[PDB]
Every structure is written in structure tokens, then in C-alpha cells.
Ligand SMILES: NC(=O)c1ccc[n+]([C@@H]2O[C@H](COP(=O)([O-])OP(=O)(O)OC[C@H]3O[C@@H](n4cnc5c(N)ncnc54)[C@H](OP(=O)(O)O)[C@@H]3O)[C@@H](O)[C@H]2O)c1
């Protein structure tokens with residue numbers, strides 16, 4: 001299966017500039033926890049913000065254009081991308097916007113990080129529909145020294 005993995009602020013806001021309007025060392029952690037050892041599909045921009053391969057996982061990129069790091073596998077098609085994975089039990093789609101939009105419909109599970117902050121952003125998340133999904137997990141955490149805001153993880157299976 002396919003899976004989306006994202007961290008949303010308020011209003012489904014996923015980011016500003018080619019950035020994230022927050023800093024949650026904890027999400028990153030949960031993120032890595034959920035991806036380690038799985039192929040991660042991403043988009044030219046998300047990749048540009050990462051800036052280096054992600055250890056422990058097969059980094060697949062989506063660029064209409066030419067690969068520019070020999071360390072990571074590039075693609076020019078959703079189908080390619082998906083091919084580029086192989087015989088794996090779960091493929092992680094890590095964003096950004098356009099990419100989400102695109103894979104949402106093929107996904108069957110979501111790992112969300114609901115951030116409790118109201119910030120202006122230029123990229124929102126695909127509108128999923130409640131009826132379809134069954135929340136199978138929640139976990140809460142209050143803000144702290146390091147994670148300046150509160151958040152709540154969640155995992156939903158497509159009903
Ligand atoms: N908040 C989170 O949970 C989370 C997770 C990931 C990313 N993000 C964020 O999301 C915002 C940026 O996302 P975005 O939507 O602007 O960019 P993106 O999805 O990361 O990058 C899009 C690029 O994908 C390439 N592309 C997409 N689909 C393609 C296809 N089918 N075939 C070929 N190329 C394809 C195009 O590249 P070219 O034309 O240049 O090749 C396109 O410009 C950020 O601020 C970032 O931090 C957030």
C-alpha cells in the first residue's frame with residue numbers, strides 16, 4: 001500500500017515559501033519513525049528543502065526534469081515513482097502539495113500531525129473526506145521547551 005505522511009497546522013496549512021512555518025523536532029522524530037526502512041516518494045521542492053538523502057530509506061524524487069544528485073533516484077511519472085519502489089508492503093509519500101493531491105486517491109492510510117497553531121501558508125492539504133476514513137489512532141503532546149506548540153498525531157485508514 002501507499003501512505004501519506006504529513007504535518008498540518010490550522011487550516012490544513014502545510015507550509016510557506018518552500019518551508020514549514022514551525023519547528024517540531026518531535027514530528028521529525030515521529031516522521032523518521034514512520035519512514036525508516038521504506039521507500040519515500042517526494043517532489044522536487046520538498047526535496048530541495050530536505051537537501052540530502054534520507055538515511056535508511058529509498059529516496060525517490062519527482063521531477064519532470066533531470067536528476068541532480070546521483071545519490072537519489074529521480075522520476076518523471078507517478079507510475080515511474082511507484083515502479084521505482086518495488087515489492088514493498090508500504091510506500092511513503094512525503095509531499096509536498098501537488099504530490100499529495102496526486103496520490104491521495106491511491107492512498108489507504110494517513111499519518112497526520114495536527115499542529116495547534118494558526119499560521120498563514122501558501123500550501124494546503126488535499127481535502128480528504130471524513131466518511132471515507134476511519135481514525136485508528138491518536139496521540140497527544142503538549143508544547144515544550146523544544147516543540148513550541150502542541151500537536152496530536154493520528155492515524156487513519158481508508159474505510
Ligand atoms: N508539512 C508537511 O507535512 C510537509 C511534507 C512535505 C512537504 N512539505 C512542504 O510543502 C510545500 C512545497 O510543496 P509543493 O507542492 O510546492 O512542491 P512538491 O510537491 O514538493 O514539488 C513539486 C514538483 O514536483 C515535480 N512534479 C510533481 N509531480 C510530477 C509528476 N507527476 N511528474 C513530474 N514531475 C512532477 C515538479 O517539478 P519540476 O518541474 O521542477 O521538475 C513540481 O514542481 C513546502 O513548504 C514544504 O515544506 C510539507
Ligand SMILES: CN(Cc1cnc2nc(N)nc(N)c2n1)c1ccc(C(=O)N[C@@H](CCC(=O)O)C(=O)O)cc1
Nearest residue numbers: 005006007027028029031032046049050054094095113
Ligand atoms: C522539510 N522536510 C519535509 C518534511 C518534514 N516534516 C514532515 N513531517 C511529517 N509528519 N510528514 C512529512 N511529510 C514531513 N515532511 C524534512 C526535513 C527534514 C527531515 C529530516 O531531517 N529527517 C530526519 C529526522 C531527524 C533530523 O532532522 O535530524 C530523518 O532521519 O528522518 C525530514 C523531512
